[PDB]
Structure 1
Amino acid sequence: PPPPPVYCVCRQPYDVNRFMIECDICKDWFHGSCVGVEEHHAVDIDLYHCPNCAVLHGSSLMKKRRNWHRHDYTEIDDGSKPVQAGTRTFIKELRSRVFPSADEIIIKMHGSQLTQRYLEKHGFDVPIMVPKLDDLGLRLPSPTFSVMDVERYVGGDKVIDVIDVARQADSKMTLHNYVKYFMNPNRPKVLNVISLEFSDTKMSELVEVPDIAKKLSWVENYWPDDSVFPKPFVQKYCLMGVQDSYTDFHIDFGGTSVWYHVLWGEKIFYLIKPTDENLARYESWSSSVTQSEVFFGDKVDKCYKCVVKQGHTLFVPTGWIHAVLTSQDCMAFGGNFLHNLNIGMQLRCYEMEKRLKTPDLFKFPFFEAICWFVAKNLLETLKELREDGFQPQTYLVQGVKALHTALKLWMKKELVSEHAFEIPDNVRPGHLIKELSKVIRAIEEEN
């Protein structure tokens, strides 16, 4: 009559969906939550000793630090091995570097002026800075809002993704434990939260994205209600990071444009323009094996340092390559959106993510799906303008044409196999491409 197999001090049966750690003394397994060990602490622990065993054997044996510049702080500090991203020395070095002020390129303006008419007329190809909050239609919680409040609304037991910035590695924590950590002024490690999307929490009630962002948003103007696919939520994000948190260079998923508002603290963006040259150097860099050892900002001609003060709102347009340094403990809200202003580049960025085989969960949920719905509606628009007297605006045409090129490419016999599952069973792929080709031919003719 063998006893049912249970583990941990809670004498519970094994659950494969829960993080556990092995005690080197008793050989049993323990739930991180039962013994107070976070998933990100596992890499620090050399040999784990559970509380009970610790009474006579002492605490766990931790790995010894010999670094300040390598992801694996155990490597000997002999001279070989370059400085890696997000480490203490890296940050020190990053803070000493000299960059061209982002003032040379970004546009600063009043919220009331930032409209779709303005964007269509002058384009949206450089970052836009909006010092004051007035006229953005951007509603956020009081500047006094604290992490304890984030916990109060969202929910203490919610599971979020944390980033051990000095290792550039991900793990998971409950929002409660993250707050406990953030609240302790003395943090033995730099942790950063950047993917806590709360549009489905009681905290959504408090935030309201910028009008321009909603006015432009693809999901907001083209994603149907009668959709079989699940509507994407990348509109409301809560960002919390302690000082010296770092995010290496990247291009937001799906070539989406984004908005950031620092409630309190100070974020520092390192902006790189989306030139063909740079976009190539980036795609190489983001795949090279020495990535973590090369500060990409050096592989290009100009890297702009944009300091975002608390109270300010920044807008980064499609394609821009950027890294972010957290000058000080900060909490900021932000969001991503796709729009017509730069249809071509968005597709360009999407094609690039596909080649870098960036993980599934690290992309934009249903990129192709939305692209279909858009092509569809734009067909009705371009057509309704023709049968109405006016000729479409240059950009929209340049864009619908790029989208046209894209849809045709996905249907291509040797390719339709992968882009197949992504088509909405609400659209006639071959049909849209035909009707779209003529309106394009028509427009191209009249002009």
Structure 2
Amino acid sequence: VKTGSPTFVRELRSRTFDSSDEVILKPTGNQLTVEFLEENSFSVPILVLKKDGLGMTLPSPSFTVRDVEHYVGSDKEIDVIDVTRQADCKMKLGDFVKYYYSGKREKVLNVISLEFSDTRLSNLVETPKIVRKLSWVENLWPEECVFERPNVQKYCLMSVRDSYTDFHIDFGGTSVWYHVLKGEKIFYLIRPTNANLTLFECWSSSSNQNEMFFGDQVDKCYKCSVKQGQTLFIPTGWIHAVLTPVDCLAFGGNFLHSLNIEMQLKAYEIEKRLSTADLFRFPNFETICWYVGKHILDIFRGLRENRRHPASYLVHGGKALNLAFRAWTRKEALPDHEDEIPETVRTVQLIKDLAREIRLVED
């Protein structure tokens, strides 16, 4: 029984699973603020039922695959995945649409990475306000910087009944948001504990990965249905698979933030080592980390220069970032990492000062 097949999907559709109501949070749009995530942390998935309060702009629930073609362009190349084959290829949007409205489910093709920020569709979609407030790339990537900026903020997903993405950790160790405009997507979510990540590493690397459903090798695997109008926020590192049970069109975006930097760095190293992608969807992770380190320094200085105290999560995030900095500039590591260090940053001094301010805020 191979991961993808109509018999695999058919079994999956029946599968038991641990309820999502156990771990997820279900705030409302207006409740999902920066304070809410600072206080609660962002370590479990978050399903908002209605979009009111999220600050999203979206087309109506009657937008279509054809509307997508209209706004992106028939000729744009798009990555498609063959779901009864788990393999990647380019395809012209037009041919996708041909295939789509045909009904010829002889192949099950799935589109999940159509990034449309440089198309006229960009103007019809605004991402959640929470994401825009948190996002590193959005807030802290400088304009004077001559490194390639990652552009992963807006994706369109068109997914046909019985599509399946297998268990993975997202590129960059990014966090993700998904809004289902129409249809449904079932997410199977597994917590990224050191314990589970080890089983995950082993399973990626396993010789017969394609024959083993990873959610059976772990303690808890949570089924979370994302129906029409609903929005899912998945935290850093969460190992997840996706079954699209009926035709679905969804939107989504990937971001990094300052709430659990240790888990971000961890999710980065692991996804780097296990990824079979030919390209980095998220180039220059380390570059953005460097720039964040200095911003974090400035914040500590500011908080101390005016006799206030930083939140615990940031102190730990800072410490974790600093370790990564030392690790990337050790004499033997430095050649794999040098190219990511922005030319304005004096790493020894950053590390030294970041270390000093962190010592001053420990008990």
Is this contact kept in 2: 1:196–1:239, CA < 8 A?
yes
Alignment of 1:338 onto 2:256: yes
CA positional deviation for 1:140: 1.0
**Which position in structure 2 is the counterpart of 1:326?**
244
In 2: Cα distance, 1:441 partner to 1:190 partner: 55
SS of 2:245's equivalent in the other structure is strand
CA positional deviation for 1:359: 3.5
In 1: Cα distance, 2:247 partner to 2:79 partner: 18
**Which position in structure 2 is the counterpart of 1:235?**
153
**Which position in structure 1 is the counterpart of 2:72?**
154
SS of 1:421's equivalent in the other structure is helix
**Which position in structure 2 is the counterpart of 1:304?**
222
**Which position in structure 1 is the counterpart of 2:94?**
176
Of 212, 220, 233, the residue aligned with 1:315 is: 233
Of 277, 290, 299, the residue aligned with 2:195 is: 277
**Which position in structure 2 is the counterpart of 1:356?**
274
CA positional deviation for 1:357: 5.7
Distance verdict in 2 for CA 1:172–1:355, change over 3 Å: closer
Alignment of 1:414 onto 2:327: no
In 2: Cα distance, 1:354 partner to 1:135 partner: 35
CA positional deviation for 1:404: 0.4
Is this contact kept in 1: 2:173–2:271, CA < 8 A?
no
**Which position in structure 2 is the counterpart of 1:58?**
none
SS of 2:247's equivalent in the other structure is strand
Instruction: Return the letter of the residue paired with 2:20.
Output: A
SS of 1:349's equivalent in the other structure is helix
TM-score, structure 2 as length reference:
0.98
**Which position in structure 1 is the counterpart of 2:290?**
372
**Which position in structure 2 is the counterpart of 1:99?**
17
Of 326, 335, 342, the residue aligned with 1:424 is: 342
SS of 1:361's equivalent in the other structure is coil
- Pairs within 5 Å for 1:35-434: 83-356=1-274, 358-434=276-352
Higher relative contact order (CA 8 A, sep 6+): 2
**Which position in structure 1 is the counterpart of 2:355?**
437
SS of 1:286's equivalent in the other structure is helix
In 1: Cα distance, 2:185 partner to 2:178 partner: 10
| % same residue | 64
CA positional deviation for 1:332: 0.3
In 2: Cα distance, 1:337 partner to 1:95 partner: 30
In 2: Cα distance, 1:206 partner to 1:146 partner: 13
Is this contact kept in 2: 1:273–1:321, CA < 8 A?
yes
Instruction: Return the letter of the residue paired with 1:386.
Output: R
CA positional deviation for 1:355: 2.9
SS of 2:183's equivalent in the other structure is strand
Instruction: Return the letter of the residue paired with 1:240.
Output: M
In 2: Cα distance, 1:360 partner to 1:190 partner: 23
Deviations 1:187-228 (A, max 9, x none): 321000111100111110011110100111011121000011
Instruction: Return the letter of the residue paired with 1:203.
Output: L
In 2: Cα distance, 1:88 partner to 1:327 partner: 12
In 2: Cα distance, 1:382 partner to 1:190 partner: 52
In 1: Cα distance, 2:295 partner to 2:354 partner: 11
Deviations 1:383-431 (A, max 9, x none): 1111011011100001100000001100011101101111111211111
In 2: Cα distance, 1:231 partner to 1:141 partner: 27
Instruction: Return the letter of the residue paired with 2:269.
Output: E
In 2: Cα distance, 1:94 partner to 1:308 partner: 16
Is this contact kept in 2: 1:274–1:320, CA < 8 A?
yes
In 2: Cα distance, 1:362 partner to 1:273 partner: 24
In 1: Cα distance, 2:69 partner to 2:227 partner: 24
Is this contact kept in 2: 1:353–1:363, CA < 8 A?
no
Deviations 1:298-342 (A, max 9, x none): 110111111110110011111111000000111100011100111
Runs of 4+ more than 4 Å apart: none
In 1: Cα distance, 2:282 partner to 2:47 partner: 25
Is this contact kept in 1: 2:137–2:256, CA < 8 A?
yes
CA positional deviation for 1:270: 0.3
Instruction: Return the letter of the residue paired with 2:322.
Output: H
CA positional deviation for 1:122: 1.1
Is this contact kept in 2: 1:263–1:311, CA < 8 A?
yes
TM-score, structure 1 as length reference:
0.80
Deviations 1:164-198 (A, max 9, x none): 11000011111111011111123321000111100
Instruction: Return the letter of the residue paired with 1:412.
Output: R
Unmatched runs of 5 consecutive residues or more in structure 1: 1-82
Instruction: Specify which structure has the higher proportion of helix.
Output: 2
Aligned residues: 363
Is this contact kept in 2: 1:198–1:236, CA < 8 A?
yes
Greater Rg, structure 1 or structure 2?
A: 1
Instruction: Return the letter of the residue paired with 2:210.
Output: S
Instruction: Return the letter of the residue paired with 2:156.
Output: C
Moved more, 236-245 or 348-357: 348-357
Instruction: Return the letter of the residue paired with 1:90.
Output: F
